Amino acid sequence: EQESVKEFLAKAKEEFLKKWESPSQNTAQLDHFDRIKTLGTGSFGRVMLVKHKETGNHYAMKILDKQKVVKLKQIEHTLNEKRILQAVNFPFLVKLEFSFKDNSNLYMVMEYVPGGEMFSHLRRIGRFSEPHARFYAAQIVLTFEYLHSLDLIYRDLKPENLLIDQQGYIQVTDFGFAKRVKGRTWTLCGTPEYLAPEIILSKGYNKAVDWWALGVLIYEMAAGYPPFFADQPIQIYEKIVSGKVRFPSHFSSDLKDLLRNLLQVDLTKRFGNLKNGVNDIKNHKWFATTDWIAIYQRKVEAPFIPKFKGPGDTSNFDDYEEEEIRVSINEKCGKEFTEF
Numbered sequence: 340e341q342e343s344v345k346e347f348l349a350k351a352k353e354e355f356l357k358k359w360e361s362p363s364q365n366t367a368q369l370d371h372f373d374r375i376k377t378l379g380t381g382s383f384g385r386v387m388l389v390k391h392k393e394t395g396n397h398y399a400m401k402i403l404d405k406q407k408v409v410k411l412k413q414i415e416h417t418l419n420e421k422r423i424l425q426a427v428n429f430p431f432l433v434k435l436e437f438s439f440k441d442n443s444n445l446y447m448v449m450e451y452v453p454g455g456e457m458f459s460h461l462r463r464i465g466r467f468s469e470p471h472a473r474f475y476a477a478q479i480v481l482t483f484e485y486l487h488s489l490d491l492i493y494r495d496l497k498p499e500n501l502l503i504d505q506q507g508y509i510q511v512t513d514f515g516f517a518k519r520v521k522g523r524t525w526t527l528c529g530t531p532e533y534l535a536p537e538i539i540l541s542k543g544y545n546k547a548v549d550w551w552a553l554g555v556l557i558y559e560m561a562a563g564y565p566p567f568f569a570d571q572p573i574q575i576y577e578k579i580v581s582g583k584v585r586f587p588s589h590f591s592s593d594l595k596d597l598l599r600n601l602l603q604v605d606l607t608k609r610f611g612n613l614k615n616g617v618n619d620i621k622n623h624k625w626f627a628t629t630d631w632i633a634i635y636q637r638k639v640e641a642p643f644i645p646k647f648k649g650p651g652d653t654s655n656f657d658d659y660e661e662e663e664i665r666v667s668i669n670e671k672c673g674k675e676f677t678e679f
């Protein structure tokens with residue numbers, strides 16, 4: 340590896356480890372913010388656009404209901420998410436500004452990226468050209484190079500988690516499945532279309548699952564649909580484990596070759612998991628036109644700038660029923676979330 344990359348990654352790991360070992364806690368409180376709009380809602384949490392009442396800055400506040408986190412067996416995952424996010428620093432990761440908890444909820448106050456999910460833009464236009472897909476893919480390659488060097492596995496790569504920023508670059512959101520792993524881990528998590536075979540088969544798995552998911556993402560960006568598509572999860576899983584993939588004729592030969600090596604069912608043969616690591620990907624012919632440094636430095640003009648009116652515009656996100664942020668008069672699940 341170029342000594343330049345080695346020294347960059349050594350510093351990145353030093354800085355991560357200092358914050359990892361001494362995490363920040365309790366750096367804001369709920370009544371510092373006004374609520375604007377619900378941007379997403381799930382079985383144990385929500386993301387809400389908020390505005391800081393003193394600075395006027397907008398943020399995407401992730402609110403997790405402690406009781407539901409416990410019921411759905413997400414305790415460790417929520418602790419992972421916050422501890423990791425407060426310790427990382429990379430251009431293509433949404434930044435965690437503040438975190439805190441109260442009697443009912445956990446809060447992660449993230450920068451608000453107003454351009455919408457990649458998923459929305461992909462579905463709007465149908466499919467991305469290869470250069471357009473490659474620009475986003477290159478950012479994910481660099482992001483995974485960074486995360487994996489810190490012993491982090493991301494485990495939730497999918498188009499909904501890639502937000503398009505004011506410069507047209509991606510920022511990855513939702514670290515709910517991210518984990519610091521030396522060696523193997525076992526939890527079943529991730530969206531069906533993106534799961535690596537070794538997850539489906541209940542094996543001890545490693546960072547190679549992220550590289551598999553990159554193959555799925557690149558395929559979906561370039562085709563408009565994912566490679567193992569089927570109507571129900573069990574049918575998806577049968578296709579994933581089969582070792583067969585079909586490519587649209589419009590794909591270039593270089594794209595097909597890269598994808599066969601990312602979508603390799605034998606994890607010991609999968610690009611990103613061989614002796615040369617990420618460099619088998621970065622040096623592949625499909626990436627021959629990619630200026631990795633210029634991407635990292637945000638010096639490349641992006642494929643498109645999302646249409647939005649300002650840092651508070653929510654037009655690129657969807658509409659959800661607006662529910663209370665109620666805080667119990669009694670502390671819930673205090674022991675479980677002590678470290679948050």
Ligand SMILES: Nc1nc([C@H]2CC(=O)OC23CCCCC3)cs1
Pocket residue numbers: 341343344347348481482484485631632635
């Ligand atoms: N020569 C150098 N390259 C960098 C960048 C850009 C790149 O290709 O990889 C880095 C370092 C490793 C993590 C991802 C970002 C920094 S110094």
